[PDB]
Amino acid sequence: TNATGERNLALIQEVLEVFPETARKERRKHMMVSDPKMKSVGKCIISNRKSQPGVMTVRGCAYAGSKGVVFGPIKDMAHISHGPVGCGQYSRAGRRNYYTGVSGVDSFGTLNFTSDFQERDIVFGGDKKLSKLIEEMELLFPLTKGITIQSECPVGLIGDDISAVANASSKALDKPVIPVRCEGFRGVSQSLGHHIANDVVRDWILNNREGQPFETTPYDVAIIGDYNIGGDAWASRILLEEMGLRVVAQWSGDGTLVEMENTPFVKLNLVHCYRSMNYIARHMEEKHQIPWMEYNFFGPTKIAESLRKIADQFDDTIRANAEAVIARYEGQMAAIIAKYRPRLEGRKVLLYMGGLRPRHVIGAYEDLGMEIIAAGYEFAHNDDYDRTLPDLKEGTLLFDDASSYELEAFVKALKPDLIGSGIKEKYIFQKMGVPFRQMHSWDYSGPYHGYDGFAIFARDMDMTLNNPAWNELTAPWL
Amino acid sequence: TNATGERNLALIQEVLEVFPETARKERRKHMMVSDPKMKSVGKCIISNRKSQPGVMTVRGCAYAGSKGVVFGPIKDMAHISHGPVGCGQYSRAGRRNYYTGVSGVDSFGTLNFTSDFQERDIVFGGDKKLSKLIEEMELLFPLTKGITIQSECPVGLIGDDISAVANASSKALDKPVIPVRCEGFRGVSQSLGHHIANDVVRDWILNNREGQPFETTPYDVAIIGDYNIGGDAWASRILLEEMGLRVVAQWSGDGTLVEMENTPFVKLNLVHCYRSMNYIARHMEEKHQIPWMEYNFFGPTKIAESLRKIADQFDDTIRANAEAVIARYEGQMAAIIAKYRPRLEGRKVLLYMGGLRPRHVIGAYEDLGMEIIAAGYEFAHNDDYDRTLPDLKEGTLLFDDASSYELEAFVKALKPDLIGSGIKEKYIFQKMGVPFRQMHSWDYSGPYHGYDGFAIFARDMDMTLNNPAWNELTAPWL
Amino acid sequence: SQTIDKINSCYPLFEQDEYQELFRNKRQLEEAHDAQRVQEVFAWTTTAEYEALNFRREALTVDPAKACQPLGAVLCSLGFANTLPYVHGSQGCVAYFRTYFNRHFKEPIACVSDSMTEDAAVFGGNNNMNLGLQNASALYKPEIIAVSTTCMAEVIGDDLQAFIANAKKDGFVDSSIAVPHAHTPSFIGSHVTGWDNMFEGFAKTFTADYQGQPGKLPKLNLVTGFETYLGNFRVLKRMMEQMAVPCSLLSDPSEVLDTPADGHYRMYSGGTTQQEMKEAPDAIDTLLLQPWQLLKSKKVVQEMWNQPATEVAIPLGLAATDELLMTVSQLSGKPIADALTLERGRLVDMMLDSHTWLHGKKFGLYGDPDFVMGLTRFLLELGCEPTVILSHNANKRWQKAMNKMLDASPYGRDSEVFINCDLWHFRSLMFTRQPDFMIGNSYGKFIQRDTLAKGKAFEVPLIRLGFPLFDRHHLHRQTTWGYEGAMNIVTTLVNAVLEKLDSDTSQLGKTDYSFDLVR
Amino acid sequence: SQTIDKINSCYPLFEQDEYQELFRNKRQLEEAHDAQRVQEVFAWTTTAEYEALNFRREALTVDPAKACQPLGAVLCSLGFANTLPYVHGSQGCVAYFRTYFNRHFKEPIACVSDSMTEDAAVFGGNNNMNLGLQNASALYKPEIIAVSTTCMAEVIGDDLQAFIANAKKDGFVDSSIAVPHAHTPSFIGSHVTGWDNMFEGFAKTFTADYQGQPGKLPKLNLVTGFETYLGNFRVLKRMMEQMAVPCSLLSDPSEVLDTPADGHYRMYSGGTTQQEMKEAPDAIDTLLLQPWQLLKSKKVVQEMWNQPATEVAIPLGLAATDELLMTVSQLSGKPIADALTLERGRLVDMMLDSHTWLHGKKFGLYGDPDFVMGLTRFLLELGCEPTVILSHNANKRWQKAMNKMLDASPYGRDSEVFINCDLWHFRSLMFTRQPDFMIGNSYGKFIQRDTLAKGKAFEVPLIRLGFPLFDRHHLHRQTTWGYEGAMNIVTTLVNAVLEKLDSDTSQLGKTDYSFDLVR
Numbered sequence A, B: 001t002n003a004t005g006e007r008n009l010a011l012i013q014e015v016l017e018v019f020p021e022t023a024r025k026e027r028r029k030h031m032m033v034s035d036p037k038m039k040s041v042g043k044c045i046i047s048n049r050k051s052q053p054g055v056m057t058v059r060g061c062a063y064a065g066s067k068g069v070v071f072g073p074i075k076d077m078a079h080i081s082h083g084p085v086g087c088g089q090y091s092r093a094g095r096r097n098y099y100t101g102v103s104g105v106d107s108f109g110t111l112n113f114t115s116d117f118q119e120r121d122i123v124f125g126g127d128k129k130l131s132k133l134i135e136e137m138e139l140l141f142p143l144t145k146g147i148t149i150q151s152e153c154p155v156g157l158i159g160d161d162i163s164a165v166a167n168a169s170s171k172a173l174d175k176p177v178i179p180v181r182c183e184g185f186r187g188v189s190q191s192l193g194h195h196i197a198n199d200v201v202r203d204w205i206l207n208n209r210e211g212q213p214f215e216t217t218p219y220d221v222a223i224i225g226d227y228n229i230g231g232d233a234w235a236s237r238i239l240l241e242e243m244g245l246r247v248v249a250q251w252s253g254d255g256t257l258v259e260m261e262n263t264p265f266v267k268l269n270l271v272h273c274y275r276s277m278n279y280i281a282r283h284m285e286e287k288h289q290i291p292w293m294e295y296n297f298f299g300p301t302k303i304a305e306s307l308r309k310i311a312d313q314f315d316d317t318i319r320a321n322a323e324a325v326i327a328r329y330e331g332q333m334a335a336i337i338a339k340y341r342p343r344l345e346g347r348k349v350l351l352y353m354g355g356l357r358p359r360h361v362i363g364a365y366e367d368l369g370m371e372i373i374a375a376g377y378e379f380a381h382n383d384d385y386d387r388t389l390p391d392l393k394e395g396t397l398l399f400d401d402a403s404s405y406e407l408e409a410f411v412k413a414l415k416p417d418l419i420g421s422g423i424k425e426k427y428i429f430q431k432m433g434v435p436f437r438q439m440h441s442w443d444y445s446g447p448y449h450g451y452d453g454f455a456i457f458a459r460d461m462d463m464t465l466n467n468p469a470w471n472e473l474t475a476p477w478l
Numbered sequence C, D: 001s002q003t004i005d006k007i008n009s010c011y012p013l014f015e016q017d018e019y020q021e022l023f024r025n026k027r028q029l030e031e032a033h034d035a036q037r038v039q040e041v042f043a044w045t046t047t048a049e050y051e052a053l054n055f056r057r058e059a060l061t062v063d064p065a066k067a068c069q070p071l072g073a074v075l076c077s078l079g080f081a082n083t084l085p086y087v088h089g090s091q092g093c094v095a096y097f098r099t100y101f102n103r104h105f106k107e108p109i110a111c112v113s114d115s116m117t118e119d120a121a122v123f124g125g126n127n128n129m130n131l132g133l134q135n136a137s138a139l140y141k142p143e144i145i146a147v148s149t150t151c152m153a154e155v156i157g158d159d160l161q162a163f164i165a166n167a168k169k170d171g172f173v174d175s176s177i178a179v180p181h182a183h184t185p186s187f188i189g190s191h192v193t194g195w196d197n198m199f200e201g202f203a204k205t206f207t208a209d210y211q212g213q214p215g216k217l218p219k220l221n222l223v224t225g226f227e228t229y230l231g232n233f234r235v236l237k238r239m240m241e242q243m244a245v246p247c248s249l250l251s252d253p254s255e256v257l258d259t260p261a262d263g264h265y266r267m268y269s270g271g272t273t274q275q276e277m278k279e280a281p282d283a284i285d286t287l288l289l290q291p292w293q294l295l296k297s298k299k300v301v302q303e304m305w306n307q308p309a310t311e312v313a314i315p316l317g318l319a320a321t322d323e324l325l326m327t328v329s330q331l332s333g334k335p336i337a338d339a340l341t342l343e344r345g346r347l348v349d350m351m352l353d354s355h356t357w358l359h360g361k362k363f364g365l366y367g368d369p370d371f372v373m374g375l376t377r378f379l380l381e382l383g384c385e386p387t388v389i390l391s392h393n394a395n396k397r398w399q400k401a402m403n404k405m406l407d408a409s410p411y412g413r414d415s416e417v418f419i420n421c422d423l424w425h426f427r428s429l430m431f432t433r434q435p436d437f438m439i440g441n442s443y444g445k446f447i448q449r450d451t452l453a454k455g456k457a458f459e460v461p462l463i464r465l466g467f468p469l470f471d472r473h474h475l476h477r478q479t480t481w482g483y484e485g486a487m488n489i490v491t492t493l494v495n496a497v498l499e500k501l502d503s504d505t506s507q508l509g510k511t512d513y514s515f516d517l518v519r
């Protein structure tokens, strides 16, 4: 490797010295330094394994992946957090998966529906309570298009059978009632909740309109794996419609059961979050012969690449439209780069997030002259690490499921100018004097996808990296 | 006198022993004990004298009486506070003389227009600055109907001639521009400002539409002396209009220059505040042959007496209308007495206000079962003391232009259950543990005139006398 | 689109015409219910008929106003020196506990899990407990690892006590480290029950073998229970210093929830020391300041420490602060400080100065049982009417006490108390009972929004007092106990009245006859 | 009409049908301008064309943002022990000074006049002074009678020093009573000029012939100038006690403006003693904390007392507090306290936690010169843009210093500074420059209302920081100086942003896509 690479390999060894020997050796396989010539990680890194007990992993659970990430955003369905009260309360309106609607009436994503398990539900089982719950829900919330049942830890452990409940209630309501066995002890992170949810969608939603008439166009697409954080999916949808495509469905930011049931009638699936929804994309290719492709709407270099490759799946009319859309936003892009690149050029960034953004935002940073010096994921798999390799400079530190200890140690040694990570990391690194931007919730700003999003992204990186308070951590007399 | 009269005469002696001998002898003539067999105060009290230097009199000045009280409420005219900046700033929107309009556009009572004298204005005189101010006013505030110039202390002292300026500017603008020599060193209190202002209205406003056609009815009246505190004059006007009268003018609460100019065409002038506007009522009787009468719209006993007497000046149609109005509000009045009189009756009140309300509100307190144990005025004249005697119980303390020492000593000795007085008295007496209601501003409530006002007055006396915090001034360990 | 000179975030970017056209077009692919039908259903959710069906619920909960046990065990643990909270069970819980407190305090929150998964569901989590204690000790070097549980661990029947005994015996955790523990099942009680359960675990670990003697130390211990205002820990210490009465708080997270941004991260800071906890049995007495939740803590104080456990009300308001200081004075034999009497008289001056805007005002309020009882009591003492009083996690014994207090007050005649009811129940009650204001936490923003959509005349504004407070900053620094806290409460209530009256009277040419400069 | 179960005050009584009808009938008797003409003129007053005419004024002042000198002298005088403020002149002035302070502080205000009338306009006010001092001494028993003047007195040219000597020589006032005086013409400067003049009078009375020696006492004196937040007097004392540096405030009215409501009225409470003022020349130095208005007080310190008068900026914000404590440290030789450095770090933590809501926000601001410079400085420190900056009573030297500070900062590039301009000028600027928010006193409420009447998109919300504050309660107890006051300012600013963003995003089904729970 190069000099940067050696320094990072030595840093790896120094950081892991604190771990008991058994964990030390296991943790060493979760980190590596990148090679520009490598095309796949092979045995250089391992991922999607259990977390080490007691280390303060950043990860969440499979209920977070299913309820919190995939199903929670669907606005026209009521999602029931089934089990005791915590899970549903801590995850009530924490993720900014934007939607429009009339809350409590035709759209339900900010309400917290729960079966609030008590000790008698654990000793006698929760299915009778679940069935009565759904009757009460239908009475007080008549405009739901369908209902999901998101299982918390206790449900499967006490032997309940929510599928039998879902089938019975779906007949009585004449609406889809969807059971999900996303108990938080299953799998190792948020990731298995994604996979569980894709399999549930495959069997309980996707075939509901098979054989029905749907009026199509040649340029019908679905956005797969964009959860509209801060309106990201609306800022992506507008470009695809400007290019002459019809976005029949959005999975699942501002999404609906109806859009999802109409997805098997589209011509092309456009996968933004590969990690969470590649499963269903591959399934629609196999069963409905719908092609799919990955794309990236972070920053002008990746948006132009994406628009051109999407248009190249159609005909010369869409190709020409792709060129006209890029030319239409050229001025706006050039003014954003001319204003903000001089304020950010040369600064170094450390990124630590779930399963996509750690590699997906690197082009936007590079469009503002910034450099990534370390990148890691909470719960990515090896195919995500493979997908990261083309966008790293040689010697970059690449790592998986870091404890708080490891992330603190990496930041103290690397001295990034800017960190992009989550809410549990923000207030630690700000006290250490490092400018920090939340790159899950966008620090209550966004959108960051698309051309309208790049302006916001650039304003926000400048705002925080150059804020005057960062020169005041040390008192003037010290 | 009775045993209360004796106790009060001994209290007068005790309180005044603090004063240097000459002030003591002077101040002894400003207090007495009431005798129900007296029609006139005669020699028993004196009033409308200069205040004692250095004693902390409650009184204000002639600019307060002219600008603050009589002219400032007139909504369609711009009133200039002419002199240094204080006077106009301290009096900006402190008096709740309510009006409707569009501020700064067709109505000006919450703006402070001032000539902001600087040392060069004292040295060279302020008439040229006044003339140029009036030109800029007209450019920036074109919808004024007229302008008044309210002199502060320095204007007459430096020899300025604002009547020459007003005459020239009124021709230049072709609108009334009215000079007022209401410098605060004139007179002894607010009172001479009222008189000055009435003389200016007599000469500069009331003759403006003389000889002109005006469509009359047989039931045209003007409300003279109701400054619409918290909408008191609206709560009064509604009863007169329900009784079949047409209120052509209201002086000057929610009033206009137009209404004042049309006052000489009415059939009857209805004087509520005798102190501040008896002058112009007597002038209208002598010059225009318009009868006038005093009335009182505080509480149901006085309201019915007043409506019947006003109606007795017309004909049997209005006499029958007075009985219909009284009957119409009798259920509202019985409900207010049934809810609040039991919560107030028996309790003793001390009143200290300007020139009218210390006697005028006594009926409404008596309708709620309360007793007045002492009543005083800041600046009333002996004809006001004469008018107070019919509504006092034998031996009541009656006094004039009290110092703060004297009010505090009367309160300490008499131990009233409730005090009604002003903003400079409020926070002293609350600390002494005596429930206190502001009886100038209505403690940001009101109206108190009229049938709709009596409900609010009863609610407010109960709220404050019976509040639970008055039982908490002494710590429980003390 | 965006212009370089004025870049717009999500709101108001999506108000632009191109996005309004995008939404109209997207709506045609959703099979939306017609606007007329959505309007009919919204109106119907504001009615007395819908309310009656809403109050027939027996199985569905919607918009709860409580959290689960281990959250409260984590907050209690954070209040001891050099302590690392550790929750035995599944890791998603710890990601959520940390995030929940991160968003209220705007601070980092240390807490680990031992990551029980499918394997531990079948074998039990003793291997996770051994490796978890070992790795946490190595990485984070705590003096105390304070263990609570998640519902998976409870349901499978993991014997906490035995697991920790095995870790000790087999060398996974050193003898220098204390490992207090409590079972905290989220299907029992709420987060306030977890706090009390964790406190009993600390009392057993640090004092069970101690032979104490009440009044050997001339001090008072204070126990707050679950409290998320930093000013409340601080005011108690400040008042006790003015009384000249030695004091320890037992669980005080106010320094670790307020470390300076000086270039260093400090995982541990301040907190009750092991010396304070170990010598607790020698104090004169321990005062349990939130009595309805501190149930096992009262048995500790009386049955383990043989102290009086003098009964005290939550010290919220004027009369409850007077009663706390008289109790401190009686137990210690020391007079109430003149600076405290002066402060008390300034609060009474504020109450008299602002009473005409507060008297008769009608409030809805919700929160934890001890907080709701204290705030209802102080509202009665102000001459306000607490017409709708809700505590999702309160019990029937509390409800009987609340009704006893309300029946005895002239200001409680129209009050209704609700237990085991949630914020969807509260939402109907704001529509049907329509109090002037509602006092609650950030979840109440959606109820204010819902009442405003019926009409401006039906809006019930929210006043933020409680937990969690996620949509305003630095309210967690405030104080709500003591005279200092009652000054904040009075100021907050009168200025909420005055901000609403200004808004109502701010229409030029229409309602601004009463937009008074002075109020 | 009124119903017994719900009595309505003025608003909203007058919204009832019978009163809307009453108003239509009265309007027919006013010769009202037509509604379209009034709308036309209102729209014209919001334009740039109107603003240009407005900025041509030379003689008319509309809605001033200053008061007159004696108001300042009365406030200075209230800060000394057992002192009765006395204003030689006409009585109307004293009713108005007492009332103006009553409505801000919610407290009584002692002040007397000697009631000069037309007779006194002829012969001079010598008899009024003699009788006034005798009668005030008898009734109120002050130790100090602090004399200032109204404009009448100044125009007449009454010789205060000679009148006060004659009173003592003739036996009208006892010789033991201190009677400091100052000439305070309201046609010069403003209320801050009064305060500084009054202070120079106290310093002459108590120190003229004193043989002082700086550093004989190892203390520092502090001089606040005209200040109406009780917390600023109190934070300065608290910080000096943490620094362990002896100190006196010279003029401290914070006790007599906050006496307890305990059944007793206390005309006098606390205040600078005569011993503190008499020994003031023996301190190491005297720090003048509002330097632009403390002009004659700097001459006292340097010319009379031969102390440095070490220059200090108003201690508002983080960097200015830092500079204050470094100056205290350097003069005293004592280190900065570890508790202060911890408080500083917590303020920085707040700043970093809230910065994304404040960065780039645009504010208008007005008030006294020292305050406006201090708050403009701190807003630049926060990454905010103070685009419209007005001080009616400031001078050209202050305006030059302000533009220098602004030009040096990345955040001052669009900032405009106005002097000798009033709130009718500021109102135009709010329409043409449209900042996000304006910081002002209660008179700004009318400008918020005016901007809202143009439309919701044009509304500029008011943030209340300054004097007077008449339409909210108890803001006068807040702190704006030191780290404690900067914590208040940061919290106030960020929560004003978040309150407005919630209101803007609170429209059910329309803007509530961005009505976020967590901010």
Ligand code: CFM
Pocket: A065, A069, A095, A190, A227, A229, A273, A274, A275, A276, A353, A354, A355, A356, A357, A358, A439, A440, A441
């Ligand atoms: S941490 Fe995305 S794979 Fe999943 S909630 Fe964030 S880096 Fe998730 S992009 Fe998405 S919207 Fe996310 S930011 Fe894939 S959905 S489990 Mo936390």
Ligand code: CLF
Pocket: A061, A062, A063, A064, A083, A084, A085, A086, A087, A088, A151, A152, A153, A182, A183, A184, A185, C068, C069, C070, C090, C091, C092, C093, C094, C096, C149, C150, C151, C152, C185, C186, C187
């Ligand atoms: S890993 Fe995930 S979040 Fe954890 S429980 Fe399991 S599904 Fe849920 Fe909800 S209630 Fe509380 S937080 Fe748990 S302990 Fe019982």
Ligand code: CLF
Pocket: B061, B062, B063, B064, B083, B084, B085, B086, B087, B088, B151, B152, B153, B182, B183, B184, B185, D068, D069, D070, D090, D091, D092, D093, D094, D096, D149, D150, D151, D152, D185, D186, D187
């Ligand atoms: S008794 Fe009356 S209020 Fe007094 S001055 Fe005279 S008219 Fe006026 Fe305005 S400016 Fe200030 S307060 Fe005066 S001292 Fe020069």
Ligand SMILES: [Cl-]
Pocket: C292, C293, C369, C393, C394, C395, C398
């Ligand atoms: Cl309870």
Ligand SMILES: [Cl-]
Pocket: D292, D293, D369, D393, D394, D395, D398
């Ligand atoms: Cl200046």
Ligand SMILES: [Mg+2]
Pocket: A100, A101, A102, C027, C032
């Ligand atoms: Mg919709």
Ligand SMILES: [Mg+2]
Pocket: B100, B101, B102, D027, D032
């Ligand atoms: Mg009008």
Ligand SMILES: [Mg+2]
Pocket: A427, C105, C106, C107, D349, D350, D353
């Ligand atoms: Mg913080």
Ligand SMILES: [Mg+2]
Pocket: B427, C349, C350, C353, D105, D106, D107
């Ligand atoms: Mg007060």
Ligand SMILES: [Mg+2]
Pocket: D406, D407, D412, D413, D415
């Ligand atoms: Mg410049």
